[PDB]
Design an enzyme around this catalytic site. Structure first.
Site, PDB file in Angstrom:
ATOM      1  N   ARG A 163      -1.990   6.226   5.296  1.00 43.42           N
ATOM      2  CA  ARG A 163      -1.065   5.122   5.499  1.00 43.42           C
ATOM      3  C   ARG A 163       0.015   5.173   4.428  1.00 43.42           C
ATOM      4  O   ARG A 163      -0.271   5.496   3.278  1.00 43.42           O
ATOM      5  CB  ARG A 163      -1.793   3.761   5.454  1.00 43.42           C
ATOM      6  CG  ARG A 163      -0.872   2.572   5.463  1.00 43.42           C
ATOM      7  CD  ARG A 163      -1.611   1.296   5.888  1.00 43.42           C
ATOM      8  NE  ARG A 163      -2.456   0.729   4.845  1.00 43.42           N
ATOM      9  CZ  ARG A 163      -3.780   0.824   4.818  1.00 43.42           C
ATOM     10  NH1 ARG A 163      -4.424   1.474   5.769  1.00 43.42           N
ATOM     11  NH2 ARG A 163      -4.467   0.251   3.841  1.00 43.42           N
TER      12      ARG A 163
ATOM     13  N   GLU B 265       3.054   2.696   2.996  1.00 44.11           N
ATOM     14  CA  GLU B 265       3.503   1.314   3.098  1.00 44.11           C
ATOM     15  C   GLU B 265       4.580   0.996   2.074  1.00 44.11           C
ATOM     16  O   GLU B 265       4.397   1.257   0.883  1.00 44.11           O
ATOM     17  CB  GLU B 265       2.330   0.348   2.925  1.00 44.11           C
ATOM     18  CG  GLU B 265       2.772  -1.067   2.674  1.00 44.11           C
ATOM     19  CD  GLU B 265       1.648  -2.091   2.845  1.00 44.11           C
ATOM     20  OE1 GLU B 265       0.487  -1.773   2.521  1.00 44.11           O
ATOM     21  OE2 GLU B 265       1.951  -3.195   3.305  1.00 44.11           O
TER      22      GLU B 265
ATOM     23  N   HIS C 260      -3.654  -0.766  14.046  1.00 45.52           N
ATOM     24  CA  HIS C 260      -3.123  -1.985  13.462  1.00 45.52           C
ATOM     25  C   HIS C 260      -1.611  -2.030  13.619  1.00 45.52           C
ATOM     26  O   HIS C 260      -0.979  -1.056  14.023  1.00 45.52           O
ATOM     27  CB  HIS C 260      -3.486  -2.100  11.983  1.00 45.52           C
ATOM     28  CG  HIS C 260      -2.945  -0.983  11.144  1.00 45.52           C
ATOM     29  ND1 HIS C 260      -1.630  -0.920  10.743  1.00 45.52           N
ATOM     30  CD2 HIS C 260      -3.553   0.097  10.604  1.00 45.52           C
ATOM     31  CE1 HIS C 260      -1.450   0.157  10.004  1.00 45.52           C
ATOM     32  NE2 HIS C 260      -2.600   0.793   9.907  1.00 45.52           N
TER      33      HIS C 260
ATOM     34  N   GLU D 236       4.124  -0.359   7.339  1.00 48.33           N
ATOM     35  CA  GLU D 236       2.934   0.369   7.005  1.00 48.33           C
ATOM     36  C   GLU D 236       2.181   1.068   8.133  1.00 48.33           C
ATOM     37  O   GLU D 236       1.056   0.814   8.401  1.00 48.33           O
ATOM     38  CB  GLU D 236       2.002  -0.588   6.248  1.00 48.33           C
ATOM     39  CG  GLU D 236       1.693  -1.817   7.055  1.00 48.33           C
ATOM     40  CD  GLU D 236       0.878  -2.848   6.296  1.00 48.33           C
ATOM     41  OE1 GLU D 236      -0.175  -2.516   5.849  1.00 48.33           O
ATOM     42  OE2 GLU D 236       1.323  -3.956   6.149  1.00 48.33           O
TER      43      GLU D 236
ATOM     44  N   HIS E  74       3.849  -6.949   8.335  1.00 48.89           N
ATOM     45  CA  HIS E  74       3.681  -8.390   8.326  1.00 48.89           C
ATOM     46  C   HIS E  74       4.709  -8.975   7.377  1.00 48.89           C
ATOM     47  O   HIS E  74       5.250  -8.271   6.527  1.00 48.89           O
ATOM     48  CB  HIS E  74       2.270  -8.762   7.885  1.00 48.89           C
ATOM     49  CG  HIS E  74       1.851  -8.056   6.646  1.00 48.89           C
ATOM     50  ND1 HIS E  74       2.230  -8.472   5.391  1.00 48.89           N
ATOM     51  CD2 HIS E  74       1.145  -6.918   6.469  1.00 48.89           C
ATOM     52  CE1 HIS E  74       1.749  -7.635   4.493  1.00 48.89           C
ATOM     53  NE2 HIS E  74       1.088  -6.685   5.122  1.00 48.89           N
TER      54      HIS E  74
END
Ligand code: PRO
Ligand code: PRO
Ligand code: PRO
Ligand code: PRO
Ligand SMILES: [Ca+2]
Ligand SMILES: [Ca+2]
Ligand SMILES: [Ca+2]
Ligand SMILES: [Ca+2]
Ligand SMILES: [Ca+2]
Ligand SMILES: [Mn+2]
Ligand SMILES: [Mn+2]
Ligand SMILES: [Mn+2]
Ligand SMILES: [Mn+2]
Ligand SMILES: [Mn+2]
Ligand SMILES: [Mn+2]
Ligand SMILES: [Mn+2]
Ligand SMILES: [Mn+2]
Ligand SMILES: [Mn+2]
Ligand SMILES: [Mn+2]
Ligand SMILES: [Mn+2]
Ligand SMILES: [Mn+2]
Ligand code: NA
Ligand code: NA
Ligand code: NA
Ligand code: NA
Lengths: 444, 449, 442, 442
Positions: free
Chosen positions: C406, C408, C350, C384, C354
């Site tokens: 992860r 973030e 991914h 992230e 964003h």
């Protein structure tokens, strides 16, 4: 408290009779009563002319002045004492009260007027009355004359002449006596206090009627029976409606508030208009329009003095406003040309003032001998220039649209100039903002 | 601010048309304007019947209801838009506003009424209007009929029957809807606050008009365009004048104050009377009279319920007041005899109440079939017993003379009896004195309220 | 707690109208209400665009902006006050509230919109609205337009232009005001505290939902009406599922826990992911993958500043993660070659972030003029990166399989770089293990 | 956790098919998914009827029951296994799960339903489905029928009857099984603990949402995926708003707190209301109103038993509350006339209860044969009398204004009476004040 004294009414009767031709008679009715809805009555207001000569507050009355009459020149027809009716409606003067309290020489029941008035009219040469003012009364009069017409063969001679009373009596009212000025001064002071209170209470989120409430509150605490006229409380775009009376709109941050209101005391008017920012601070565009109007307000006083003509004050306000509108870019061109073409009427479309007195738009001839009236001491009037930029005036920049400003003061002509009665509520930008800031911090 | 919703006016129009006979037409004018002095107008007040069916606030309008008209049953004549006039007097709804904002099917300028309305009347069997209510309108109608009469050549047929509209419409007005009760509750609440402020501010040395000021102040802060009726503020002996309106006397220590006042909201009345001591404390004579009126006030409520007839409340107050006047020694004799010979009327000479609504003394028939009307839910009325000892009443001890007391509430008949709308302003002696003492104390401390 | 002030909504209204072509109108509906089951409603969430311009929290409303309109540029249609309904459903603003509390120039009942709105549209050159956002409204709009053209003979003129409002309005939302940053700071702070609590309570034997409980508890105590998105609480191999939402597995000794969760405040989002050992101690393999993800996280901030373009942070995380995977032996070959063939997507599939704002995946154009947008102060976004080794991935040694990580953070661009909003919950191995140890007694 | 066992779902399918006429087919879709804002979805909630028959938690599914079908009576269309999607989305049961853990006889990908279902419908006499419940599903069914009708020439026979499934299925749901009672009992226990925590934490200066935080916290710690309904936390005058959900007001000393809230477990509701003083001590007026509602609550139970009809409990609460209002002086007159003319509705304007089950206002017919339903063992319902004095009700003494009280329990009809499930959170004045006193001191 503050009121016209009993003897002054007598003095006015004397002054009117002294201008009547010999062997004449003057007749004036009281004002009618009106029903507001079903059986609820409107507040009663005595007719200004009738009040001016009698000080008599009741309806269903008629007065007669008969100069040289042996038994007495002043006759009053009025309601009779009636114990049952006065139980419901309040005390009546009656015929004894008319003579004693109100100074009549003779007094008779209003129910008997048909049986009496014709006899008093008989033998007089002239009848002075307000032709056309009250058609119901004019018919009543013609009946009384017809009664005289029946006995003509008995040597009863009806009058041959009817003369318009308002011409003479309104010219009297145009010159205010010291006591009249005193009452108007007091009314102006009550109204000034009312306007201040409206400024001090105003904040965004209230409605226009909240400020009307403050006005009526102060009016009535001063003893006012009623305003001199329906109060105008116009927020924002509503200030561009000259006689706005809905008084029901929410007040918004950034609005100007235009308030035109004044109480009346003992049937004498006051008339004031102030404009102020709802949030306590004039925007730059509001301030510029306001201070232009204020310039025109101040300039008009310099043209109110004995020997000046009535229209000079108005014309001064036109010059000031047109020149200012050019300076601001709201009008383009030559000031003299714009005035001649009346270009300023897009923004200032009403007169700078009117006579002031027992009626807010008072009686009195503005023109005499094909000329504007020459001012003399004792004349009273308003000064109320304004600027109104309609919300849809596409010919000016968007920041100007929807701004309405009027600044109105009450004035009396003096020997050396004029006297302003309404200086008790401020009109400079600084004083207004100071006044509103002080109230804001006191409330917090 | 509370108000009758647009949909309710439409429902009233429909209910009225459902009672009209077929092929008929109803016509109502707006109220006239009156000049108060010179060119100053009186405050404008829409005619109650016109307002009841339209909600339209402007003068110089005429409405017409034409049941079964395919083109639209509701027609409104009103002022047209006029820019110069509106610059001065304010914006007008116009014909587009009449249809849009006020729900009319068709709208026409008031200036064209003579050229349009006769045609709508033509062919109808009956015209419903308020016979005699507006003589000027009655004249206009006769002209319109004469116009139809003069088109027989074209086969025009004038109606031959003219029916008093108030019979049907005023009976509709007698039954208050839920929305109407909501408006009346609010009006009563506003008036209650105004009466409280009058009490709290009163002190010897003020004038009666200082108290009227407080009433108008609170009315207008609550949105009232005007009072329901001219306020009565009567100090001392003035309280013995039932509709005293001079309101100009100085208040003296020892005076009672009788205030009869109420606002109106969206043309719906409120009507409250309270009596209280000008110095915050009822004298023994004042208290004795006051508690007797209060007893009558409370007793009246027990006779206001579905099935009771209209006069039962008044009779109860007559029994209570007559019995109490004997008890105090102000009357003498048998209570039943004194009532039959109306001896109480020297002290209590008016009725115990009236219908309440868009007019303070509201419309509606007090008698049907020669008998007093039977009460039903939705009917609204006042309860206002009183006792007035004239200052010159030599038949009683001097200590009683000049005392006047009235205690008035507004009520609505309910399925379970009645609902009083005016409890927001107290009426027992203790509460009144407590209320006045608290305000005096707070004012001495310069606390704000 | 903190909220956008009334004046800012007006400022945004003014800013949007300043960009509309003259003699045009913009129209926005509120969000619909949804039934969850039978007669139970879903929690109501105002449409972000409608909220951004009005702050008006009610359904069954439509706003219109009419530049230059003489009687007021801002009109709101909304519900009427209704005593019987409000007794059950709560208070309504009504038309008076719309004008007073919310600053509308005019306000009309929503039930009259069919009789009023067409007349306001008539004579306008251009209508700005969000084509396709609310198809029921799109249909509704077409009906209103049909009313205008039915009166065409009279001189009633429908508009000839429809403009996608998203283009203008979403570019507005892309630049966060000072008041917006303040709200987003607060939401980040609440979410940080929530993440800490989850770390402090976690122990083998609890379930994922026990940790979701701590999150919702802290979110709501801080004033959040709802999370910014459904919380992810993924233990063990569930951490390899990106949008794992079952949140119903038992926590086992040796598990990692990955938590992706954030609250929203006054319709503004926060978005935090932290990964941590269930038993308080990163294993050697867990620590190796974790510190690599952390290296990527830290590297990305250096590519977030005015002048940089949007995708630079992502590219950096890609370089770091591929290089580390080679160094650890999970990938093999030349780093630049592996990147060209996206061999890293077997573990990092991914994007690195964003836009962040009123919607978690906020509005705003990532590409301008066919190229990645240049960052400017006031833009907000997430960082992230992550690594996820499927339990079944036989191309690496067994000791790595089943590890997902992860890390973030939320970031706002500044004059000279960026501001990290989410430093309030730690991310180094040492601080995390110390946090969990200190909580043990408690 | 506590949950409905897989055998029970099979039993329910058998019981329904035994009520269908031969050679018929029943069809039920899953609940739709909703977007909350932008790309953030609302929490998913399976349709109660679909859930009741399948236990299947996913969207994008359709079940079919074909009694007497040789190749399998129970067919499930659902999402097919898809590795890329699962990596992001979450694991799917797939066709393997459907016939496996969920017990379907046959299973097909939902993407192929248009190519299979019509063939299953063809040749059946009747189709049973929930007419009008899901308009999207309705038009999908009409299409499936139309494709059969296009084959009429080639021998295809479409069904001619379409029967409301609701009536049969909702009547099944009205009689709670032993396992369903076990689930509801647990849900009630969890909600009981949540209400206690709200009482224990409450103090002036907090906000309504702080108490909602405690409720959600305890709900989620017990395994609830969502409340049974949006929690009502109403302080002070807000208690007169029957479904107040703003939950944003500051709690003041002297306020009552009305909390109506309940978790759901495995899609089974609980529903509890308690009212308590913010400061731990009922004022005299608060106490008098509270005690009257409590008398009404306790009295209701005496009229819940087999043979009693549904409305007898409600009638009891009306009788008790009217008498108590007369005694307190809020009403005046004859109690029987006040009841007959509904004088109590000024203060008690809702019903005393509702069916309780998978939906909090559960399915089932309140009236049979023009009469109130006769109660039988296994039916479940609430008891929730209340009294509400508006702040501006001037028909009563000032000291009563602004007081709102509701006391709600959940109940199951037993062979000789009823069983109260919600006794775990107290309701006497003494126990409440003692509970709050102990928490304040510790
Ligand atoms: O209201 C006004 O502005 C003008 C002044 C003269 C009379 N009316
Ligand atoms: O007519 C009535 O009933 C009351 C008495 C005084 C004023 N109006
Ligand atoms: O959009 C993104 O960048 C992240 C990746 C994991 C979940 N959503
Ligand atoms: O409206 C309902 O359905 C329940 C009854 C009491 C309050 N809430
Ligand atoms: Ca209605
Ligand atoms: Ca604010
Ligand atoms: Ca315009
Ligand atoms: Ca079993
Ligand atoms: Ca009945
Ligand atoms: Mn003026
Ligand atoms: Mn004027
Ligand atoms: Mn003037
Ligand atoms: Mn009265
Ligand atoms: Mn009355
Ligand atoms: Mn009266
Ligand atoms: Mn995230
Ligand atoms: Mn994210
Ligand atoms: Mn996310
Ligand atoms: Mn319930
Ligand atoms: Mn409940
Ligand atoms: Mn409920
Ligand atoms: Na309305
Ligand atoms: Na006092
Ligand atoms: Na180790
Ligand atoms: Na059902």
């Amino acid at each position: 408290m503050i009121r016209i004294p009993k003897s002054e009414y007598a003095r006015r009767r004397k002054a009117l009779m002294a201008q009547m031709e010999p062997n004449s008679i003057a007749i004036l009715p009281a004002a009618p009563m009106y029903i507001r809805n079903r059986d609820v009555e409107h507040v009663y207001r005595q007719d200004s002319d009738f009040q001016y000569l009698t000080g008599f507050p009741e309806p269903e009355a008629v007065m007669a002045l008969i100069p040289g009459r042996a038994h007495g020149e002043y006759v009053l027809f009025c309601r009779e004492r009636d114990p049952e009716r006065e139980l419901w409606d309040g005390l009546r003067a009656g015929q004894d009260g008319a003579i004693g309290q109100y100074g009549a020489d003779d007094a008779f029941p209003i129910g008997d007027i048909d049986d009496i008035l014709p006899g008093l009219i008989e033998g007089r040469d002239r009848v002075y009355y307000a032709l056309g003012a009250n058609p119901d009364f004019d018919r009543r009069l013609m009946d009384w004359i017809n009664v005289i017409r029946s006995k003509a063969r008995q040597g009863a001679q009806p009058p041959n002449e009817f003369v318009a009373l308002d011409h003479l009596l309104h010219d009297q009212r145009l010159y205010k006596s010291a006591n009249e000025v005193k009452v108007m001064r007091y009314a102006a002071e009550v109204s000034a206090r009312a306007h201040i209170r409206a400024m001090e209470v105003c904040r965004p989120g209230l409605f226009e009627y909240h400020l009307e409430a403050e006005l009526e509150y102060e009016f009535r605490k001063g003893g006012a029976k009623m305003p001199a006229y329906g109060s105008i409380v116009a927020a924002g775009r509503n200030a561009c409606i000259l006689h706005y009376r809905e008084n029901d709109a929410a007040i918004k941050d950034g609005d100007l508030i235009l308030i035109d209101a004044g109480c009346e005391i003992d049937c004498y008017a006051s008339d004031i208009t102030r404009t102020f920012p709802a949030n306590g601070r004039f925007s730059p565009e509001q301030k510029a329009i306001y201070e232009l109007v204020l310039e025109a307000n101040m300039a008009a006083f310099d043209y109110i003095a004995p020997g000046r003509h009535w229209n000079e004050a108005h014309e001064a306000t036109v010059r000031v406003i047109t020149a200012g509108l050019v300076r601001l870019g709201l009008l383009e061109g030559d000031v003299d040309e714009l005035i001649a073409h009346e270009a300023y009427k897009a923004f200032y479309m009403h007169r700078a003032g009117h006579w002031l007195g027992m009626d807010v738009h008072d009686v009195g001839e503005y023109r005499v001998g094909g000329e504007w009236r020459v001012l003399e001491p004792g004349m009273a009037m308003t000064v109320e220039p304004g600027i109104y930029i309609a919300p849809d005036n596409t010919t000016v920049a968007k920041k100007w649209r929807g701004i309405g400003v009027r600044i109105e003061d009450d004035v009396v002509v003096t020997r050396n100039g004029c006297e302003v009665l309404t200086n008790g509520v401020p009109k400079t930008v600084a004083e207004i903002e100071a006044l509103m800031a002080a109230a804001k911090s006191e409330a917090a």
